Swiss-Prot record, chain B:
The chain holds residues 28 to 47 of 276 of the full protein. It is found in: Cell inner membrane. This is Cell division protein FtsQ. It comes from Escherichia coli (strain K12). Changing L6R: No change in activity. Correctly assembled, interacts with FtsB and FtsL, but fails to localize efficiently to the cell division site. Does not insert into the membrane and lack of activity. The chain crosses the membrane at residues 5-24. The lineage of its organism: Bacteria, Pseudomonadati, Pseudomonadota, Gammaproteobacteria, Enterobacterales.
Length: 58, 55, 406
């Protein structure tokens, strides 16, 4: 009995949480995807470059 | 109380520190090399004024 | 975009982001150096791609020392509690003890990691497997961790954001491209991988939606009477996060889920060793349910450690303010406790679903099993990226003081 009341109160509580809107959500997603992509390309480039440098210097 | 569960948690995470006394059994459902990369820095825990009346 | 170009225009922001990229270069350079007495020309069990570097410990023991020192403050070591109530000087002494603890725990985990690494490749990993070379390479690994913490302090002083967070983010994203190479070497497969990429971006959007959400409890203050009617947009409140723990409960759950396999391999090989190793595998649906239950229980415990509604009700009563309508003694504690029960249920289920997602990604995409793309590493990457962007936006914004003359 109390579990249904508790879950009803959970969905009542979630309507008071201050969720972000659409525009800041897509802006934040642009930031995190851009940083993930940039640091992926960054670490790949530096790994290839210093591996070639190590195989040059022995 | 809560001191007991707190020390149980602490002794289990120090068992995570020494959870490498075995590594051989080569790749299976073993999470320790996977748990090498799930960490964040945990977040920290949490007179009278006056004024000059220009008389 | 506009903000990134404005970051590059400002001299100070561009200088510190250049210094941050240089420190990440230094980190990767230290990754590509091996430990002395190790062969490592035996290229490979699984997920152990480099894993034997100077930074092979990573910043694992600093995080473990931080969560240990943080756990001890809630009345286990009363010296630590009185360090925590002494103010900023006590916090400085706690940070000094955290430095000593991470050096010690880095040494201990380096010994355990080395003896396990020799136990893994077949003995032929380490040459001359004695205790002297174990002490040597434990000193090397603890020196690597100490240099990593020094790099973190340098990159939080002269750099962009947090130090340890940027280094952990560097570890994860530097682990990405070899996973992409394994994907492209391994391969209706292409549309399968495209559906997984769409699910990854949807999970990133869901993570940002859960994570950046606050419950704003309004708080009136008794000492300062609001004698002037404000615009009301920036009223004082107490924001509670939906996921107040973070990823710490995943660490506690994997500790509880790998400790009986290590002690059952310590016991030897019996039938119950095979039963423990078959039943505490979270890739299987008897171990995954224990994993989910442990994650839920530990995020309830850890978000009652983190928020601590009795101590925050005490802190609210002891200086002024209250919640409008609710007496500031026991009743604000019960109010904040019930709010925390609801929010921790939601953030609990979120964290458990995120932590068991790569099990359902490997069993749908047939990826390499050591990928684990979409795990809690996604949560760490998203948190570090958004916090670093917020810090950069703050340092950008100060300059934007116009004045009415313009």
């Amino acid at each position: 009995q109390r579990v249904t009341n508790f879950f009803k109160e959970v969905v009542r509580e979630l309507k008071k949480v201050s969720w972000p809107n659409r525009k800041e959500l897509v802006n934040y997603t642009a930031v995190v995807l851009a940083t993930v992509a940039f640091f992926t390309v960054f670490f790949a480039v530096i790994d290839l470059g210093i591996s070639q440098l190590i195989r040059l210097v022995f | 109380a809560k001191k007991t569960i707190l020390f149980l948690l602490t002794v289990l995470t120090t068992v995570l520190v020494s959870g490498w006394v075995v590594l051989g059994a080569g790749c299976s459902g073993v999470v320790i090399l996977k748990t090498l990369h799930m960490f964040e820095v945990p977040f920290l825990l949490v007179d009278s004024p006056h004024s000059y009346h220009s008389g | 975009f506009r903000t990134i170009s404005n970051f590059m225009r400002v001299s100070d922001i561009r200088n510190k982001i250049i210094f941050t990229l240089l420190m990440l270069i230094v980190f990767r350079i230290g990754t590509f150096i091996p430990v002395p007495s190790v062969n490592t020309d035996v290229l490979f069990c699984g997920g152990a791609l480099q894993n034997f570097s100077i930074f092979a410990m990573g910043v694992m023991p600093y995080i473990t020392a931080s969560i240990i020192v943080q756990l001890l403050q809630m009345d286990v070591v009363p010296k630590f509690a009185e360090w925590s109530k002494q103010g900023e000087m006590g916090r400085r002494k706690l940070a000094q003890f955290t430095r000593y603890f991470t050096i010690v725990l880095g040494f201990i985990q380096a010994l355990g990691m080395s003896y396990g690494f020799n136990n893994l490749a077949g003995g032929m990993l380490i040459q001359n497997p004695g205790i002297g070379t174990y002490l040597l390479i434990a000193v090397v690994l603890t020196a690597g961790t100490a240099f990593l913490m020094w790099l973190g302090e340098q990159i939080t002083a002269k750099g962009v954001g947090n130090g340890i967070s940027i280094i952990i983010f560097a570890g994860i994203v530097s682990g990405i491209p070899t996973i992409l190479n394994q994907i492209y070497a391994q391969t209706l497969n292409i549309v399968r991988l495209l559906l997984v990429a769409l699910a990854v971006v949807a999970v990133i959007v869901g993570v940002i939606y859960i994570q950046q959400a606050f419950r704003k409890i309004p708080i009136q203050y008794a000492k300062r009477l609001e004698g002037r009617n404000p615009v009301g947009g920036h009223s004082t409140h107490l924001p509670l996060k939906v996921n107040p723990a973070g990823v710490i409960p995943v660490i506690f759950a994997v500790s509880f889920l790998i400790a009986p396999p290590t002690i059952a391999s310590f016991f030897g090989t019996n039938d119950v060793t095979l039963w423990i190793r078959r039943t505490f595998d979270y890739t299987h649906p008897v171990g995954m349910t224990i994993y989910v239950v442990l994650i839920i229980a530990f995020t309830y415990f850890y978000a009652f450690v983190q928020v601590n509604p009795e101590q925050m009700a005490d802190n609210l009563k002891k200086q002024g303010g209250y919640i409008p309508g609710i007496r500031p003694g026991k009743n604000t504690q019960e109010y904040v406790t019930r709010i925390l029960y609801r929010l921790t249920l939601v953030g609990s289920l979120f964290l458990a679903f995120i932590a068991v997602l790569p099990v359902f990604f490997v069993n749908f995409a047939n990826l390499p099993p050591s990928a684990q793309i979409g795990g809690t590493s996604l949560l760490i990457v998203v948190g570090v990226a958004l916090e670093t962007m917020k810090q950069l936006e703050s340092q950008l914004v100060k300059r934007h003081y116009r004045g009415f003359i313009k």
